Amino acid sequence: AINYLGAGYDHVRGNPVGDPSSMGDPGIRPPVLRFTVLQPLGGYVRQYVACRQSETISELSNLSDYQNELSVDASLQGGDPIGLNSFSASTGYRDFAKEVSKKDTRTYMLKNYCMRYEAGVAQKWNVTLAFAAGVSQLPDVFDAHNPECACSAEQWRQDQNAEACTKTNVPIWISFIEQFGTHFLVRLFAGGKMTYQVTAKRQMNVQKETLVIGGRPPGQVSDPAALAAWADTVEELPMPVKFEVQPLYHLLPVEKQEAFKQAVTFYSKAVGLTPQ
Amino acid sequence: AINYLGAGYDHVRGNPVGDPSSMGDPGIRPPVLRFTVLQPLGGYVRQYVACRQSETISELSNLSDYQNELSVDASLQGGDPIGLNSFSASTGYRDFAKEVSKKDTRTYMLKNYCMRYEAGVAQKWNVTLAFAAGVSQLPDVFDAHNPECACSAEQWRQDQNAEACTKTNVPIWISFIEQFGTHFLVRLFAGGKMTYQVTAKRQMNVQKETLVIGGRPPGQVSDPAALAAWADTVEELPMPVKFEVQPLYHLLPVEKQEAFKQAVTFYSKAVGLTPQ
Amino acid sequence: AINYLGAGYDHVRGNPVGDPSSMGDPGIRPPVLRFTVLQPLGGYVRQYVACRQSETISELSNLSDYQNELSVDASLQGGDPIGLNSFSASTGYRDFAKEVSKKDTRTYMLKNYCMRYEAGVAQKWNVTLAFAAGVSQLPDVFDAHNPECACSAEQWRQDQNAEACTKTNVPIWISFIEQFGTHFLVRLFAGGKMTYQVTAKRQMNVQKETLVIGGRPPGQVSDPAALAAWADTVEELPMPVKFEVQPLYHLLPVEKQEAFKQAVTFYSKAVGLTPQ
Amino acid sequence: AINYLGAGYDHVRGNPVGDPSSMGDPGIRPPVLRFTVLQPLGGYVRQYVACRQSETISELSNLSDYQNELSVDASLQGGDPIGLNSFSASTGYRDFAKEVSKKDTRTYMLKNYCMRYEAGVAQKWNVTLAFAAGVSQLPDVFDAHNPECACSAEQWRQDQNAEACTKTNVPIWISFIEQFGTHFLVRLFAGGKMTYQVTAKRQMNVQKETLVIGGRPPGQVSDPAALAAWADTVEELPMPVKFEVQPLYHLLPVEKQEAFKQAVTFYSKAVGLTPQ
Amino acid sequence: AINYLGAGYDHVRGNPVGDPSSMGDPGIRPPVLRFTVLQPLGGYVRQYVACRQSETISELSNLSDYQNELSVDASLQGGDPIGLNSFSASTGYRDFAKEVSKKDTRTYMLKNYCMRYEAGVAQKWNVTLAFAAGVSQLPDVFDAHNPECACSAEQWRQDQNAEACTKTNVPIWISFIEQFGTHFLVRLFAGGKMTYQVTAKRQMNVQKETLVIGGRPPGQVSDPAALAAWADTVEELPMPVKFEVQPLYHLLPVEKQEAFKQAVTFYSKAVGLTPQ
Amino acid sequence: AINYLGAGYDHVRGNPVGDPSSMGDPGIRPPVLRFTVLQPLGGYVRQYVACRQSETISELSNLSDYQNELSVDASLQGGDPIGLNSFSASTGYRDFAKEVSKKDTRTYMLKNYCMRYEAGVAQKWNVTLAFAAGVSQLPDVFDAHNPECACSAEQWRQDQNAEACTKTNVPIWISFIEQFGTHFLVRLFAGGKMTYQVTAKRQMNVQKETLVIGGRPPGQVSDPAALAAWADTVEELPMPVKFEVQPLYHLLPVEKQEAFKQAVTFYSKAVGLTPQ
Amino acid sequence: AINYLGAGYDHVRGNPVGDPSSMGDPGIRPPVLRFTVLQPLGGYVRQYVACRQSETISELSNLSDYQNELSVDASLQGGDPIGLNSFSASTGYRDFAKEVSKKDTRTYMLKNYCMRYEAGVAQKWNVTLAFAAGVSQLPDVFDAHNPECACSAEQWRQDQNAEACTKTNVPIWISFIEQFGTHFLVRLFAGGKMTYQVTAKRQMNVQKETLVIGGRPPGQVSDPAALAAWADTVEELPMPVKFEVQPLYHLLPVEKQEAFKQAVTFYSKAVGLTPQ
């Protein structure tokens, strides 16, 4: 199978309940860590018998409830929320924000977890060649940290190709974040997750959307046979459905860590959506 | 595939749950906008993995409930209803109006969405050559806006070939509306939609009609195999199943915008059906 | 194809779910109206894409439930039932009447509509040459309307060749009704209809009869392939599966209308079956 | 084709689902009635379009359930069962009686009717020359009706050639019954009937026997092509698959009717099998 | 054709689903009974129209299931199993015993019966000249019935030519059993039988063996044409496919019956295979 | 015909589904055993009626599945696999290894057995004169068993004519193995076997190769007539299609058995292909 | 027979399914390699028994599918496609390109291989005298590799006799390529190959063309006898039907290898057809 331990993660564009254009969390990025059934040196893989099943149901009354339901599946190591406008750039976040503004409807989220294994690290890491080469091209200073820098977070959101930004090294830092994300996975449960978002008016007006992580693309969620076939494909293509992350600056040389932290703060503001 | 972004739309004759004489919404009209996987300049196309699945169920107690269920899939940009006798000239609207008048039966609508991609524009447009040539033949004044004009909306409904109307420029304006519609699509979800309208008496008397948007014509809705084959054809022939529109007068020169707005108001009254 | 718009219809001998000796409703009669894809002057034809599919299921607890299920597919213009012992002379009506008398069984009717087009008129008609010549041979008076006329409805049912009837003009009127029916079709949905009448005892004792309208004769209803081939023949030979009728006396000269109405009343009693 | 209207019928040896040594009901006997597409004087023939299809399924828990399933297809005029040990001398009855005694198995019967026409009489009949000559040789008294007659029903079952019986006229009466039966057909549906008797143990142990009425002998019931070819031969050789009978004594002179009724009662006991 | 009524039958070496070295049951032996379309005195022959078709399917989970499936086609008169290590010396029994020991596979048996006639006796028999002469050479005592007789069943299985056995009359008795068997057929269905033994692993690993009784040798079971030609040869060479037997000692003089019963018990142990 | 009982067998070069350069298994070697319809002393021959037909189908997902499908037809006495790189030097093994490496295709194997007889031995054998003379020329020691012997299995694979090997007795042992093989047949089914290896891409892209054992060379597998003619030649030239073998060292004097076992181990490594 | 091992091959003009003007691949060129049943030094020849039969079927939806079906039979050593506009100058490629442009038809390719032997080399080669003399006349530089050289690939396609090209050494290099090709065969299967290209409209409109490699010219593909006679001639005149090639520059002196590679690139562009 595919190893997701040590994968990069964009906390702003991520969404741990899924995305219609991906079979997994849209924030997962190429592998950042390099490793040595089989146990990776410095970590562990614990395989399950069939699928470890769990279900959750939540009434999502506001954006904060939705944020909390996502943070449960994509948090910092230990369970604390990532914060910093996490998930706010994903399609699912913008879709729910529209529905929760309508005070005439109420939405519920029903998660169904189909976990197949758990993996994690415990801590002297080596990064991939791609990540190391990317880091070697980074400067030691983030230009937008300077006060009255022409390239602000608002300027980047409006036009990143403007002269105010293309003269600074800000585009170099953002290209790095766009490639590898802002965090990386240190612990994960992999398998499948089928989530139903059910909206009821205030007429038995009910709407249901299905969001799927893991396995092969499912043809029909309402078909009993098509749902069962999807779970059989989850064994073949398991993907992270609940994970914990560590900030990426821990993997950079110390002279670049402060600039990268400023870069992800800039990135969270320019790409992330505050509730406005 | 076929581009439906920028397609004209007749809000009066349209019906976003379908029509037995069309594989799509019968209000979709030839392309009005001209554009430059591949991204259109000024817009975007977001392709999905397999099909983005959603289902809705609603009890349709009166004509207003049916109107609301259609407006969900064909609205103004932002979600507001088009209004102005929208959908009232379609076959499906007249069929449901007959069934809802019978107080001894109750009808439910079950939608099944099979969305394959999303497209939209964000706003300096260029129209098609057909639309530009059509606009160049339009006058600057709509004759029926003049008080005591012999060609009224009622006169047009009774006999549009009468001398009262053929002397005015009203037939020229209506031929334009009949060709391109009254609005145009600015955002759309494309794919397939299978809707069941289920009517129960007050005897297990139950009637079910199937209405299909998108894909190839389905041979048997009750056959499990024929339904699955239809979804496989939805990948090949996706069509708009939920979209948002902007009024067409925004695309006309300013000296003709006021006359066109009067023309669509006239058109909505003469062709559209008030609940009488 | 064959035009059924304006066809005569015997409401007493008709049966809109079918007959084992006909591929269509056994009450359909030769064309009464003459007309001028292609649109008939004074009417319309609306062709469908593939087949417009609808299904109904009903528990038939008594003869009235069966009558209602037939009246749905063969009614007066507007939806009102024809009445006047409608369908009571058909084989299917007599078959169901026998089964419903057995209180130890319960019967259900499952309709499957495969509609291919809709046609209708809106109202100065011209009748066929056969119908006009038939009308010219009719008297102005119906003899059995006279009190104490020897030829009563009971006498006609027992022996129509008796002297009591052969001396009156009653046989002339009945020969006209036997040729053209009592009504004529003004609106129709054409295609195919497969109806299952399922009877369950009170042992999994279940009986199922198949009744077919439209297309070519089907070899095996249980064969999946033979059923699909039948639908392909429905495109070639579509027939009325749900229609609305107008009384034939509207097409006769005024001096003969009252006598014809008395003739169809006589015909409905002598040929039709009251529930005895 | 061959006329079966008015055919004699042995209710004891008959079996309306078939017999391996006959292509039809083994109780059908040579024609008893003589008659004058073409309509027989005093009766009717109603030809079907293709085949009128019906299917039945029944769980046969005991001998009474099997008896009821046969009586459905061979009953008295009106639907009442013939009774009097009907069908009990047929091979199929004895075969099923053996299987139903095994309480470790369960048997189901699946009938498939392929009806091609219906025929019947309504009531002054004339019998065939063979039947009239047979009746002329019958006595006016049945000897075994006399109390303490040496030739009893048990004596006939043990040895009909014994002196106790050969001295009476009992062998003359039984030879008549053996030639023409005990009843005669007054109404019938003709065509084909394929019946499956499926027995399941309590291992997927399932047994299926095929019993066929009508058409040409079928080579392979499991072959799809061989089954379809059989139905094509049903058009050529249709045979009664569901019929109603009247007792034969109605066709005898009154002075012999009472003796014949005693003869068929004797015959039903001596040849028929009580459940012992 | 060839008469199999009264044929000898070796219950130990027999196998009613067939043998690759025979066209029939390998336990059928030369005729033991002598008899006098045509009906044998004391018995009956009932000829079928074409072929009486029946099919069975069974999952054979252990040796007992296989034994039961064979006993269905070769049993004592009345249906009771023969027992006494029946069928255990046949090639097919040893082949299946090997496959059922593999717990990683599952085997199914599919029987297809093509019965052409039934024959039987009801009970003063006369045996053939060969059988009578064979019986006249038999002693009145079976030597191995004596306790501590050197010729035991184990000794016969190891070396029947040893001095321990050649001094006794045991070889005389076994030569009789080897010629005529242990039972004889009293009732039989004759025709053809094609049986498929299908073994599936736990990869779509499936194995199928074909075993044929009756008719001419079939060239290709997978060829549709070669299978149909085989059935045409079944009419020419019908053989017993389901029969009932009676022990042979009923045909011996009373002074030899007890010794013969001991001989068949000895034979069943020495030649038959207990599940070890 | 030709006796294959006691034939030598090269387990490394063998392939029981065939070879394009042989009409039989390419591992069959000249006769090793000498023997005395007709029964060989110490063994048996069981002739079949026509052909004993069996068919198998298997999806071959990896090299292990292919190995298992061959081991079914060429195993140790009892059914255990030979192992020791069996079949790995055959052309068919190398061909399949290439196709299974392509993860974009899937291959199935369809076997069709046409068995004509079975033969075997039960155990004091005498070998042929050729085998005895060959054994007399063998040393008592295998030189490559000595540690740090210059002639290793790798050295033999690279250049067997090098000085490192030509000085040892290794070439003498390998010439013996090349002549007689490593095992010998103790039980066999002889006849014909036609195997189809069908490869499907992931476009209906399908490839099929035919591999034939037994009979005369077939001109066209797709021709129905040419296939039937091949089976007629299988009767004339039957060859082993499923057999069991015993190691050859059992036939050597005890002082040479250990050296021969080391020789076949050396041979299996130098000539056989490990999955690299 | 004729040796094709080491034959030159024009990858641009070649076509491994055939050509109407050749009995073999039209890209095969005279022998380039010189060698020493009989085994060539440095290579091998493996003769088959009769013909090794294989069949393939493929739906050719676009030019890429056709390219893939040819590349299967003419690839680089190892199976990788040659590329570089391979096969694009052959008649068959241009014929199929015309048919695949018609979106109203669908074409399938059915290959039938009749392989008689396999040959190959493993690697110090010696070339033929013709090839060596040809190479000695080649320059060390390819003139068209120089930027702004008047003789471009387009100029060569339009007029190779123009002054722009006749002044350079380009015609010398192209004459060499035209004589010996661009690659040479290192491994081959020889025999016959009959390929059917079947085109169906969307009326049972079907077209079939036959393309033949190997043997003598066949008179009638539809004649069963003429097809069989062709296979008998395949034994006499076997030709390569599936082969692998190595680039010719490996056979040139190192000082000319770079210029020859530029020459074949030039040749592939000037003679080969890009999909325009």
Ligand SMILES: *[C@@H]1O[C@H](CO)[C@@H](O)[C@H](O)[C@H]1NC(C)=O
């Ligand atoms: C990668 O890091 C591990 C410790 O996590 C270390 O054992 C290993 O040596 C490193 N890789 C290499 C190639 O040395």
Ligand SMILES: *[C@@H]1O[C@H](CO)[C@@H](O)[C@H](O)[C@H]1NC(C)=O
């Ligand atoms: C069409 O409009 C786009 C902007 O939407 C513009 O870039 C383009 O130049 C216009 N078309 C042409 C032919 O110029």
Ligand SMILES: *[C@@H]1O[C@H](CO)[C@@H](O)[C@H](O)[C@H]1NC(C)=O
């Ligand atoms: C038939 O009636 C139509 C109107 O329904 C009329 O236009 C036409 O003239 C009539 N037929 C003829 C032959 O005039």
Ligand SMILES: *[C@@H]1O[C@H](CO)[C@@H](O)[C@H](O)[C@H]1NC(C)=O
């Ligand atoms: C037979 O009976 C019919 C009435 O069922 C009668 O009309 C006819 O005359 C009779 N046959 C003859 C030969 O008279």
Ligand SMILES: *[C@@H]1O[C@H](CO)[C@@H](O)[C@H](O)[C@H]1NC(C)=O
């Ligand atoms: C054979 O036995 C039958 C009774 O089964 C008997 O009728 C006949 O006489 C016997 N055979 C001879 C030759 O007598």
Ligand SMILES: *[C@@H]1O[C@H](CO)[C@@H](O)[C@H](O)[C@H]1NC(C)=O
């Ligand atoms: C060959 O061996 C058999 C036993 O398998 C033996 O009977 C025979 O005597 C041996 N051959 C000779 C020539 O003795």
Ligand SMILES: *[C@@H]1O[C@H](CO)[C@@H](O)[C@H](O)[C@H]1NC(C)=O
């Ligand atoms: C040709 O090359 C071979 C090796 O492939 C070599 O053995 C031979 O000597 C060469 N030809 C001549 C004439 O030497």
